[PDB]
Ligand binder design. Structure first.
Ligand SMILES: O=C(O)c1cc(/N=N/c2ccc(S(=O)(=O)Nc3ccccn3)cc2)ccc1O
Length: 125
C-alpha cells in the first residue's frame, strides 16, 4: 500500500518569493520535467501499480518532481536549499532502491547531471 504523498501545502507556513525559488520553478523544474527520462519521476512512486511491494520498506523519504512542482507553486519552500534537497532525495532514492548499472539509475544520473548544470546558474540577489 502506498503512503500518502509528501505534504505540499500548509496554510500556516509563511511565504516569500525569491529570485532563486522563481528560477527553480520556471527554469530548473520546467527543464527537467520535459527531459526524455523525466516520466518515472513526475509523480510519487506507486508501488501497487508498479508491482514494487518492497519499495516503501526501503524508501522512507519518498520524493518526486510532481511533489516538488506543487511545493514551489504553493510557496511551500522558504529556502532554495529545501528544494535542492528534495531533488537530491529524489535522485538518491532511485540509487538506493535500484543498483549500479540499472537503466533507471543511468536515467536518474542523466537527470541529476542536468539538474547540477541548471543550478550552477542560480541567480543571485
Ligand atoms: O515508474 C516508472 O515509471 C518506472 C520506469 C522505469 N523505466 N525504466 C526504463 C525506461 C526506459 C528505458 S530505455 O528504453 O529508454 N533504455 C535505456 C535508457 C537509459 C539507459 C539505458 N537504456 C529503460 C528503462 C523503471 C522503473 C520505474 O519504476
Amino acid at each position: 500500500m502506498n503512503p500518502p504523498p509528501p505534504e505540499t501545502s500548509n496554510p500556516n507556513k509563511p511565504k516569500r518569493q525569491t529570485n532563486q525559488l522563481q528560477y527553480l520553478l520556471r527554469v530548473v523544474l520546467k527543464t527537467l520535467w520535459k527531459h526524455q527520462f523525466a516520466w518515472p519521476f513526475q509523480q510519487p512512486v506507486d508501488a501497487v501499480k508498479l508491482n514494487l511491494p518492497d519499495y516503501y520498506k526501503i524508501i522512507k523519504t519518498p520524493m518526486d518532481m510532481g511533489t516538488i512542482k506543487k511545493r514551489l507553486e504553493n510557496n511551500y519552500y522558504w529556502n532554495a536549499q529545501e528544494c535542492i534537497q528534495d531533488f537530491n532525495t529524489m535522485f538518491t532514492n532511485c540509487y538506493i532502491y535500484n543498483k549500479p548499472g540499472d537503466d533507471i539509475v543511468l536515467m536518474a544520473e542523466a537527470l541529476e547531471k542536468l539538474f547540477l548544470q541548471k543550478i550552477n546558474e542560480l541567480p543571485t540577489e
